[PDB]
Design a protein around this ligand. Structure first.
Ligand SMILES: CCCCCCCCCCCC[N+](C)(C)[O-]
Length: 418
């Protein structure tokens, strides 16, 4: 998953988010799978957070001989979640929740030789969801939900050695000797590492909806199909570039540092997910899922000026991708519950499109969790998950890098009910 997040509950973390639309042992699940609402016969609560500790690294050498060693470019994060589910009557119930389905944060040193293709990239996302559900009969249930997505993002790029590279090019071609071509490679080579090559930031809201059909063969077996609509966010922020208005080459529009309104449309992929849950035995349940995310909808990142011109652009060309997950839950005794999960979700970025801003790659999830219930009305969820990613090669601009990533997740949630 590119800039997607799966941390909506601590229970799901311990089970590697496998079959999340077919399980409902705690309120956290109905946040992304509405129909599960008809699985609760009483007001239920849950709140907590997942701490993410990534270890992402970039390596390589610039044509300028300088090092492209970006060490630990992914900051640690806390992704909170909060859930409420309540029955209206015997046929209807609803739910509310706050979670985060998208996010990203990559930051290099502004003196990094790769400044032009990697400086600072941040995307914070908050999703407010109000849902409702209807239970046709003992087998079928229907869930509808509306979402309010808030997103704050900030992109800033610099110039690593581009000045030295272009200046070195201007001094290798015939136009080198020219007292004009040299006063050109003296200016180019002049630009410092930390020279804000671009700056975009802004906040905005997007809206979307959910639909799920839950089918249960019985009290111990059910399967489900859920639709998560795409969400477009039309930002309206601030753009600028410290490069002299003169420089206006495949460079972002220079504004001599001045700021001007900027417009950008972020496309958050829609999602389809089929899942099942099998309570094979009084104490064991098996849960699995396949998720299809159409990252195709995220074709680019283009910034427009009020006038309509392009101030900043970056091709992304993402392809739809799948996430596969298998896990099991051990309902030990009235007090203890244990869970494991393994999962694999392949990155939607084609090798040809990879960039150091989203050091993304195929991922392996291995996870474990436990749940202590204090009395059937209160419980705590503790989950842990290990993430390791495929190491890949990146060709961006004149540079060539190589990145690898691994991450650890710890999460805690407290549950309550009446
Ligand atoms: C006018 C400002 C518009 C805000 C620009 C915010 C873009 C957030 C996109 C995050 C995706 C990260 N990526 C593609 C750059 O690696």
């Amino acid at each position: 998953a590119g800039f997607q997040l799966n941390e909506f509950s601590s229970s799901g973390l311990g089970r590697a988010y496998s079959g999340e639309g077919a399980i409902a042992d705690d309120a956290g699940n109905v946040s992304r799978n509405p129909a599960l609402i008809t699985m609760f016969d009483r007001p239920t609560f849950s709140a907590g957070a997942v701490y993410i500790d990534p270890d992402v690294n970039i390596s390589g050498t610039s044509p300028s001989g300088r090092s492209l060693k970006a060490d630990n470019i992914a900051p640690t994060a806390w992704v909170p979640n909060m859930h409420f589910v309540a029955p209206i009557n015997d046929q209807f119930g609803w739910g509310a929740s706050i979670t985060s389905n998208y996010g990203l944060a990559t930051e290099f040193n502004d003196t990094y030789a790769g400044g032009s293709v990697g400086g600072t990239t941040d995307l914070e996302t908050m999703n407010l969801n109000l849902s409702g559900a209807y239970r046709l009969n003992n087998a079928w249930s229907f869930g509808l939900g509306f979402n309010a997505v808030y997103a704050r993002a900030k992109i800033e790029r610099f110039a690593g050695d581009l000045g030295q590279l272009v200046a070195g090019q201007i001094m290798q071609s015939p136009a080198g000797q020219t007292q004009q071509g040299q006063a050109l490679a003296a200016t180019a080579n002049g630009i410092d590492s930390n020279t804000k090559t671009a700056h975009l930031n802004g906040n905005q809201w997007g809206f979307g909806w959910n639909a799920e059909i839950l089918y249960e063969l019985d009290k111990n077996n059910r399967y489900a199909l859920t639709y998560r609509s795409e969400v477009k966010i039309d930002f309206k922020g601030n753009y600028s570039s410290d490069l002299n208005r003169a420089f206006n080459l495949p460079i972002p529009t220079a504004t001599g540092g001045a700021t001007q309104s900027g417009y950008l449309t972020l496309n958050l992929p829609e999602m389809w997910e089929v899942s099942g849950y099998n309570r094979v035995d009084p104490q064991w349940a098996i849960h699995y899922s396949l998720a299809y995310t159409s990252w195709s909808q995220f074709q680019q990142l283009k910034a427009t000026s009020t006038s309509g011109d392009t101030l900043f652009q970056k091709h992304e060309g993402f392809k739809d991708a799948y996430r596969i997950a298998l896990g099991t839950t051990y309902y030990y005794d009235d007090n203890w519950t244990f869970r494991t999960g393994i999962a694999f979700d392949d990155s939607p970025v084609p090798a040809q499109n990879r960039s150091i801003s989203i050091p993304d790659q195929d991922r392996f999830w291995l996870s474990a969790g436990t749940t202590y219930a204090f009395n059937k009305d209160a419980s705590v969820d503790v989950g842990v998950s290990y993430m390791h990613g495929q190491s890949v090669k990146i060709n961006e601009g004149p540079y060539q890098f190589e990145s690898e990533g691994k991450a650890w997740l710890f999460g805690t949630n407290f549950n309550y009910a009446f």
